[PDB]
Amino acid sequence: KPQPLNPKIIIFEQENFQGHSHELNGPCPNLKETGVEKAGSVLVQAGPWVGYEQANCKGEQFVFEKGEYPRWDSWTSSRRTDSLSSLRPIKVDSQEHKITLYENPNFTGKKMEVIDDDVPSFHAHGYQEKVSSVRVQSGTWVGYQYPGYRGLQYLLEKGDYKDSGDFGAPQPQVQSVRRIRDMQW
Amino acid sequence: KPQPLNPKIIIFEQENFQGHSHELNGPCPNLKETGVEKAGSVLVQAGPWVGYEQANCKGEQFVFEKGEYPRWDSWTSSRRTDSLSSLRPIKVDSQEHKITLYENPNFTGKKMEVIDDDVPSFHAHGYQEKVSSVRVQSGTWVGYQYPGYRGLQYLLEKGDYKDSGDFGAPQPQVQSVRRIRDMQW
Amino acid sequence: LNPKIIIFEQENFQGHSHELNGPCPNLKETGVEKAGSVLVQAGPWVGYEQANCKGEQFVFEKGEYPRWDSWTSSRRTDSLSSLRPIKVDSQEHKITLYENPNFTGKKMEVIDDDVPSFHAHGYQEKVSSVRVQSGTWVGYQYPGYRGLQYLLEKGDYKDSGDFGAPQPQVQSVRRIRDMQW
Amino acid sequence: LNPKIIIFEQENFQGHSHELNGPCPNLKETGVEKAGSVLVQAGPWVGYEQANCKGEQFVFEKGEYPRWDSWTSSRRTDSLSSLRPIKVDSQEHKITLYENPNFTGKKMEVIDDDVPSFHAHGYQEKVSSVRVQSGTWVGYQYPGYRGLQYLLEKGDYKDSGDFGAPQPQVQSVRRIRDMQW
């Protein structure tokens, strides 16, 4: 289906998602000046978002996340109800480290997208093709030449690498990947 | 393609996988009584396998894994050559913990297969359907009712569970999963 | 220590204190209906709505639950009827590097992860024994997995030789994860 | 400590010892052509075949490399021509729970993982401060994530109140992983 370019969330009316609801797509510090008045139920189609008990954002919050929230009890283990007054999307910080290898130079064709997780045989994660291009989004990676990080070593830090010509290889042969994980200087 | 029911590995002859090779599918404590004589190169189509320098299995081993091993230097960072004499498959011990949720009772239909990794919104790992069956292969899991492991709790230990009727739920509603990870008794 | 849970009388840990170290089907009548707290000193356990460990459930991990409002992210249950220690299927991959031989002095316990270099872990000593508890590992000579490989698998390695190490040098250890067949 | 590498004269750490704490383009001529060892006391660094840091590479992590046979899982290189400290992009998600207020005494550092219960981690004390370094976390009241939620995000929380805690109770912390939009 279509992939949202922003947070979504349809706080309802009759609970159980029955009837009469409004979709809010970004901060909304109140809820009367909303099609709705009292937080009926909640449907989250892309989050996460963080609530509040007191409009203008203060009070006992709650963290809603993709899924269905069928009724008041539903987003408060607290049994402390009096619904939804503030609704802000959580703009979550998340730290991944990605190197993405490419089939043919110029970063096109079949790729092998790896993250944090280190990989020894590219041949076993299903990639089989030669490796000619690479775009290092983050982390410090050290791509070997055979499986079990053995043979020829190549350092691969932040920056796209278009050819072995600029990523120091003879045969565009990287069987394995390793992430450097620690410094001490 | 077809999924092997056993280890594979075609130690070759002319290096670079050129010419004249033999496929070994299980322990083979020697290599003359092989189409081959001297470990030319190695192609592994399903491993891992562990070698040796001295037939009958003793000496300086090496661990080959899916991928191509183009020439002697290739599976020895040691530069200590004199090829392959013993070839045994590694029958690796690996410990995963799996709970696998099901769409319709009787463990059929759309499933959500989770491992070690805990999951909060099933709705966000792409599963959307109700949850009526479950087969707990391992680990100690505690499946909630909404996202963020909230609402109703269900314990789910080793054993298949055919209905809420036997897995204690009212509405076949498990939005989240959690693995118990530690004991202290 | 076997399971240790303390059922109290009322909120905020006041009054009636009792311990428990095993299952309990009708604790409700064993002398406990005033369940207005819960302390776990070792578990995890499980509570119930009804008794005989049947009914909507709850799980206790360890530490305080001042009011029923922790175990019932609601209130649609009954009053704590039964209890029961939980049995945890938790697998781990433990290798343990013994500096001296036959398990002595310096020691490195590795649990699931890959170690490109022992030095940075504080391990600067030789290696002579290796008693593998789970999983398939393979020990390198120098760090970064370069050098001599040493499959190390479920079992005991008596000496560096006892696992093909000419010299007792092993600076790296990494888990073998997959199985292709 | 800045990068610290010691280039030696010959095998097994014998002879000529030199330290290094920065890059070095032609160390080969700086007085070092007899590269028959390498000790890393802090890195990681990188070697080269040729000089100017150009040529087939190698990486040193920390601890001993008695003979060229570690850095060259071959021998198709030149003799150690340049060196250079490495810059590591390593992200972590650190939350740190300060027992007293304004950062004092007991403290819990959490790095990436989910903590269903602090008690089992040894943390049995209240909470009053929380200085979040990375990632989006959310603090529970009781353990198992039941109770009061507290988004805790990049920044400093001065007191339990300073992050909506009526009472300074927080037994669980779990990372928020996804972003849907």
Q: How far apart are CA C132 and CA B165, in angstroms?
A: 43
Chain Cα centroid distance, residue B100: 16
Task: Determine whether B131 is exposed, middle or buried from the number of CB atoms within 10 Å of its CB (0-12, 13-18, 19+).
Answer: buried
Placement of tokens 């095998």 in the chain:
D11
Counting the structural domains of chain D, the total is 2
Amino acid in position D94: K
Would you state the structure tokens that stand for residue B127, as one six-digit string? 């599963």
The residues, any chain, with a CB within 8 Å of residue B58's CB and separated by 6 or more, are B52, B86
Q: Cα–Cα distances in Å, from A87 out to A41, A50, A62, A75, A159? A: 13, 6, 10, 13, 38
Q: How was this structure determined?
A: X-ray
- Report the 10 Å Cβ neighbour count for A28: 20
SS3 content of chain A, % helix, strand, coil (to 5): 5, 30, 65
Q: Which residue of C has its CA nearest to D66?
A: C142
Residue span of the structural domain in which D66 resides: 3-88
- Find out whether A127 and A134 touch, Cβ atoms under 8 Å: no
> Which of A52, D139, C61 minimizes the C-alpha distance to B148?
D139
Chains that touch D (3 or more CB pairs under 8 A): A, B, C
Beta strands in B62-166 (DSSP E): 63-64, 67-69, 86-89, 98-104, 108-115, 133-136, 140-143, 154-156, 159-161
Give a yes or no: residue A1 inside a domain.
Answer: no
Phi first, then psi: give them for residue D120, nearest 5 degrees. Answer: -55, -15
Bridge pairing between strands C129-140 and C107-111: unpaired
Q: How far apart are CA B73 and CA B67, in angstroms?
A: 15
The residues, any chain, with a CB within 8 Å of residue D45's CB and separated by 6 or more, are D3, D5, D59, D60, D83, D84, D85, D86
- Find out whether C127 and C160 touch, Cβ atoms under 8 Å: yes
Task: Note whether D56 and D120 are same-domain residues.
Answer: no
- The angstrom resolution of this structure is 3.3
The answer to whether the Cβ–Cβ distance between B150 and A68 falls below 8 Å is: no
- Find out whether D67 and D12 touch, Cβ atoms under 8 Å: yes
Q: Which CATH number characterizes residue A108's domain?
A: 2.60.20.10
Task: Note whether D66 and D96 are same-domain residues.
Answer: no
CA distance A80 to chain C (A): 9
Chain Cα centroid distance, residue A155: 26
Q: Cα–Cα distances in Å, from C138 out to A125, B31, B81, B107? A: 20, 24, 20, 39
Report DSSP state, residue C29: H
Q: How far apart are CA D111 and CA D103, in angstroms?
A: 18
Give a yes or no: residue A33 inside a domain.
Answer: yes
Provide Rg for chain D, Cα atoms: 24
Task: Note whether C125 and C114 are same-domain residues.
Answer: yes
Task: Determine whether C174 is exposed, middle or buried from the number of CB atoms within 10 Å of its CB (0-12, 13-18, 19+).
Answer: buried
- Find out whether B127 and B142 touch, Cβ atoms under 8 Å: no
Cis peptide upstream of residue C44 (ω within 30 degrees of 0): yes
Would you state the structure tokens that stand for residue B83, as one six-digit string? 């090829």
Q: In what order do the strands lie in the sheet with A63-64?
A: A63-64, A49-52, A86-89
Task: Note whether C84 and C26 are same-domain residues.
Answer: yes
Task: Note whether D53 and D112 are same-domain residues.
Answer: no
The answer to whether the Cβ–Cβ distance between A64 and B175 falls below 8 Å is: no
Placement of tokens 């938790």 in the chain:
C90
Task: Note whether B55 and B99 are same-domain residues.
Answer: no
CA distance D6 to chain B (A): 23
Task: Note whether D94 and D175 are same-domain residues.
Answer: yes
User: Most A CBs within 10 Å: which of B121, B129, B177, as the mutation test of the A interface?
Assistant: B121
Would you state the structure tokens that stand for residue C3, as one six-digit string? 């399971």
Q: How far apart are CA B42 and CA B58, in angstroms?
A: 19
Q: How far apart are CA B29 and CA C150, in angstroms?
A: 18
Task: Note whether C151 and C132 are same-domain residues.
Answer: yes
> Which of A125, A132, A124, A130 minimizes the C-alpha distance to A108?
A132
User: Most C CBs within 10 Å: which of A72, A122, A155, A178, as the mutation test of the C interface?
Assistant: A178
Which of D55, D73, D88 is the last residue before a domain boundary? D88
Q: How far apart are CA C20 and CA B101, in angstroms?
A: 34
Task: Note whether B107 and B88 are same-domain residues.
Answer: no
Phi first, then psi: give them for residue C120, nearest 5 degrees. Answer: -55, -15
Amino acid in position C34: K
Chain A residues in contact with C177 (beta carbon < 8 A): 120
Amino acid in position B164: S
Task: Note whether A78 and A147 are same-domain residues.
Answer: no
Q: Which helix (H) or strand (E) holds A164?
A: helix A164-167
Which of A61, A92, A123 is the last residue before a domain boundary? A92
- Find out whether A43 and A12 touch, Cβ atoms under 8 Å: yes
CA distance A125 to chain B (A): 9
Would you state the structure tokens that stand for residue A182, as one six-digit string? 């620690």
Phi first, then psi: give them for residue B43, nearest 5 degrees. Answer: -120, 115
Give a yes or no: residue B2 inside a domain.
Answer: no
> Which of A70, A75, A103 minimizes the C-alpha distance to A87?
A75
For chain B, the farthest-separated pair of C-alpha atoms sits apart, in whole angstroms, at 67
Residue D51: left (phi > 0), alpha (psi -120 to 50), or beta?
beta
Placement of tokens 């969330």 in the chain:
A9
**Any B CB within 8 A of D146 CB:** yes
Per-window interface: B 46-85 vs D, CB < 8 A: 73, 76-79
Chain A residues in contact with B123 (beta carbon < 8 A): 44, 66-68
The answer to whether the Cβ–Cβ distance between D119 and C71 falls below 8 Å is: no
Which of D88, D111, D136 is the last residue before a domain boundary? D88
Q: Cα–Cα distances in Å, from B157 out to B83, B85, B97, B143, B178? A: 49, 46, 11, 11, 12
Task: Note whether C95 and C123 are same-domain residues.
Answer: yes
Task: Note whether A112 and A177 are same-domain residues.
Answer: yes
**SS3 assignment, position D81:** coil
